[PDB]
Amino acid sequence: RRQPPEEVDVLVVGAGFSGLYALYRLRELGRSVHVIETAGDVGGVWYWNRYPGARCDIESIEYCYSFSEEVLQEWNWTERYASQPEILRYINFVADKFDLRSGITFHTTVTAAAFDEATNTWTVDTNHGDRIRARYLIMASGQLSVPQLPNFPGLKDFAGNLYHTGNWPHEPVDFSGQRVGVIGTGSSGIQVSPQIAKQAAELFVFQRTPHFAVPARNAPLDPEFLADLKKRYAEFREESRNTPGGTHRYQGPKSALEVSDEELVETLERYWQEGGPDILAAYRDILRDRDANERVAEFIRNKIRNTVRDPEVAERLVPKGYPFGTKRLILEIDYYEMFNRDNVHLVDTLSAPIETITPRGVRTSEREYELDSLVLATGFDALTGALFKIDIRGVGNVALKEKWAAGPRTYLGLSTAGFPNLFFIAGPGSPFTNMLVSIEQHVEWVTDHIAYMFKNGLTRSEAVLEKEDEWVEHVNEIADETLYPMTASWYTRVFMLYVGGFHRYRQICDEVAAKGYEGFVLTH
Ligand SMILES: Cc1cc2nc3c(=O)[nH]c(=O)nc-3n(C[C@H](O)[C@H](O)[C@H](O)COP(=O)(O)OP(=O)(O)OC[C@H]3O[C@@H](n4cnc5c(N)ncnc54)[C@H](O)[C@@H]3O)c2cc1C
Ligand SMILES: NC(=O)c1ccc[n+]([C@@H]2O[C@H](COP(=O)([O-])OP(=O)(O)OC[C@H]3O[C@@H](n4cnc5c(N)ncnc54)[C@H](OP(=O)(O)O)[C@@H]3O)[C@@H](O)[C@H]2O)c1
């Protein structure tokens, strides 16, 4: 185990995409920097989430680093949407190339962080009893990094094999001949289930809220196409950085409501056949007008009923009541087709809720299911989850958990008043988008600022209370013009993610920096 140093200019928490780039860039800026990571190796979500079928919902050519021209040119994606093992190889490739592991302490969990106003330094403690003093602390601790604690009664009494998708075994699990249950029909459950169906004697899928999901239409990435792209990657990447989604995606000019029924079909069928999440932009108002939303939502509801041959199964799979695409659109590869199989059973817990786990399996209010294995695809804590497991204390020894008790309040999503020299990467108040575009922007902003602090001899950077309030207000106002607040997931009041688009978000941050970091108080 690599032991962390006693002092460093910057301490990073987390060794996924975000923390690795921060480590990379601070080295390039001539700053001392070190990374603390719980996991045994690099990767973050792509180290932990090793379940069969784990796959990205952003195209390979967009979900990737761009800071290295060498990496863009030497690496070769294989599919439209990269599988978890490929991406982890990608990340491992970059870590080897840039010798990043020499600045990471693995197997170690930051447990406390307290700011010393007298030394303008953070004292950072871990479960191994390390104590690290760093001028700045970067939290690259993720948004989907803490598996939600499934709190079913009787869970400990389950006789069989228990698995969670967010912490899958590092050796492949053979489900052949078994009765297997999957609890959760979000992205992880929609991804892992069709893999397990290929092996299990019987699969039971326990669904509570049904969610929208459209075909991935995954495919091999044509080498020639890729070799053409590599000749223009930097320009292609700048194009992505000038979109709302941080990805190439057609912006439909037509309102969903000003079109004939037959056109709406033909147009949506194009997207349904082409696959991917781009259908979200099919018409300009899908996320701004409920009637428009519904019109698009009914098209997809009918695609479900037309895929599932049992009308009773099909309609339990149809999402109703909540707007389409207000929750990040799931892509599915043969998930709906899966229920046409003899060995697959959809279990509607809204109809009959889970009363307890038993030695033998799962007991709903109406019957008991005997299972050899139980797979929990039950999601993660709120994006505040990883930070909230750390005892973070700022000015006046106030805890971060107390300050974010009624929602995570920040300035720009990067810092919060009363906690100086503390930055959050791809965290609350930041933009929802292609996380690699957003991570790169965030890491460059944060480390640029740290470089500015050192160049000018300043040692304390702190967001101004009033600007933080102003930002929460602004984030709330943008979202309110949207269907997003209609989905409770965006609160933990503080609407959690900026929905004004990556491009508008980058422009805001750039102008803050060009104006001497307006809204931060910088002192020595
Ligand atoms: C299966 C899956 C698919 C996804 N697909 C997409 C997609 O298609 N598009 C997209 O935009 N996003 C996607 N995401 C979101 C994903 O989180 C981001 O794309 C990106 O990987 C986040 O990188 P990160 O380094 O900021 O966070 P993470 O990858 O979560 O890294 C955080 C790291 O910090 C570590 N850590 C946390 N707390 C501590 C602590 N106290 N001490 C030490 N270490 C700590 C964790 O162990 C973890 O390794 C997906 C996520 C998952 C799980
Ligand atoms: N690229 C990809 O394909 C991919 C893969 C994984 C994750 N992601 C992203 O990362 C995030 C996490 O996705 P996720 O699927 O793992 O979690 P999730 O989206 O929050 O869904 C969790 C599922 O488990 C169910 N569940 C949770 N607790 C339950 C309980 N006590 N009883 C019954 N059912 C319960 C939920 O039902 P309810 O809906 O009723 O609560 C839900 O269906 C998502 O935002 C997703 O976009 C993307």
Handedness of CA 161, 166, 170, 176 (dihedral sign): positive
Question: Which residue type occupies 119?
Answer: T
Give me the long-range contacts of 289-295 (CB less than 8 A, separation at least 24): 289/255, 289/256, 289/257, 289/483, 290/323, 290/483, 291/257, 292/255, 292/256, 292/257, 293/256, 293/323, 293/324, 293/325, 293/483, 294/323, 294/324, 295/256, 295/257, 295/264
**CA–CA gap between residue 284 and residue 485 (Å, rounded):** 18
The per-residue DSSP string of 315-350 comes to HHHS--SS-TTSSPPEEESSHHHHTTSTTEEEEETT
The strand pairing partners of 520, in sequence order, are 463
Is residue 85 assigned to a domain?
yes
Are 82 and 101 within one domain? yes
Which of residues 328, 360, 379 is at a domain's end?
Answer: 379
Q: By what method was this entry solved?
A: X-ray
Enter the tokens of residue 75.
């690496």
Are 515 and 419 within one domain? yes
Is residue 282 assigned to a domain?
no
Is residue 230 assigned to a domain?
no
Is residue 139 assigned to a domain?
yes
| Dist. CA 495 → ligand 2 center (Å) | 19
Q: Is 250 within any annotated ligand binding site?
A: no
Enter the tokens of residue 129.
């009893």
Enclosing domain of residue 171: 156-203+344-379
Exposed (0-12), middle (13-18) or buried (19+): which is 63, by Cβ within 10 Å? buried
**CA–CA gap between residue 342 and residue 8 (Å, rounded):** 59
Question: Which residue type occupies 443?
Answer: V
| Dist. CA 524 → ligand 2 center (Å) | 45
Our count of domains for the chain comes to: 2
- Of the candidates 57, 23, 66, 36, the one whose C-alpha atom is nearest the C-alpha of residue 441 is 66
**CA–CA gap between residue 55 and residue 250 (Å, rounded):** 23
Are 516 and 446 within one domain? yes
**CA–CA gap between residue 166 and residue 377 (Å, rounded):** 8
**Domain CATH number, residue 356:** 3.50.50.60
C-alpha distances in Å from residue 383, one per residue of 157, 389, 432: 30, 12, 12
Rounded to 5 degrees, what are φ and ψ at 251? -95, 105
Q: Is 36 within any annotated ligand binding site?
A: no
Is residue 365 assigned to a domain?
yes
Exposed (0-12), middle (13-18) or buried (19+): which is 152, by Cβ within 10 Å? middle
Are 58 and 169 within one domain? no
Are 59 and 123 within one domain? yes
Query: Residue 390: CB within 6 Å of ligand 1?
Result: yes
Question: Which residue type occupies 481?
Answer: E
Q: How far is CA 27 from the centre of its chain?
A: 26
Are 407 and 431 within one domain? yes
Compute the 3-state secondary structure of the chain and give helix, strand, coil in percent, each to the nearest 5: 35, 20, 45
Pocket test of ligand 1: the residue of 57, 61, 138, 145 to mutate, having most ligand atoms within 8 Å of its CB, is 145
Question: Which residue type occupies 289?
Answer: D
Helix (H) or strand (E) holding 387: helix 385-388
Are 102 and 120 within one domain? yes
Q: How far is CA 502 from the centre of its chain?
A: 15
Is residue 333 assigned to a domain?
no
> 327-364 burial string, b = 16+ CB within 10 Å, else e?
bebbbbbbbbbbbeeebbbbbbbeeeebeebbebbbbb
Which of residues 361, 379, 397 is at a domain's end?
Answer: 379
Whose Cα sits closest to atom 20 in ligand 2?
379
Is residue 330 assigned to a domain?
no
Are 475 and 354 within one domain? no
Contact between 338 and 213 (Cβ < 8 Å): no
Exposed (0-12), middle (13-18) or buried (19+): which is 273, by Cβ within 10 Å? exposed
**CA–CA gap between residue 81 and residue 331 (Å, rounded):** 10
107 Ramachandran zone, left/alpha/beta (phi>0; psi -120 to 50):
left
Which of residues 328, 361, 379 is at a domain's end?
Answer: 379
Are 375 and 404 within one domain? no
| Dist. CA 360 → ligand 2 center (Å) | 25
Resolution in A: 2.0
Whose Cα sits closest to atom 48 in ligand 2?
187
Enter the tokens of residue 458.
């300043």
**CA–CA gap between residue 177 and residue 169 (Å, rounded):** 19
C-alpha distances in Å from residue 126, one per residue of 39, 130, 182, 188: 14, 5, 34, 30
For residue 230, give the 3-state DSSP assignment: helix
- Of the candidates 74, 78, 90, 77, the one whose C-alpha atom is nearest the C-alpha of residue 17 is 90
Are 372 and 456 within one domain? no
CA atoms within 13 A on the CB side of 395: 14
Residue in the structure block whose two tokens are 């107390």: 402
H-type helices in 214-289, by residue range? 223-230, 233-241, 261-274
Are 110 and 170 within one domain? no
Is residue 63 assigned to a domain?
yes
Enter the tokens of residue 286.
């899908």
Are 30 and 42 within one domain? yes
Query: Residue 377: CB within 6 Å of ligand 1?
Result: no
Enter the tokens of residue 484.
């997003």
Whose Cα sits closest to atom 23 in ligand 2?
184
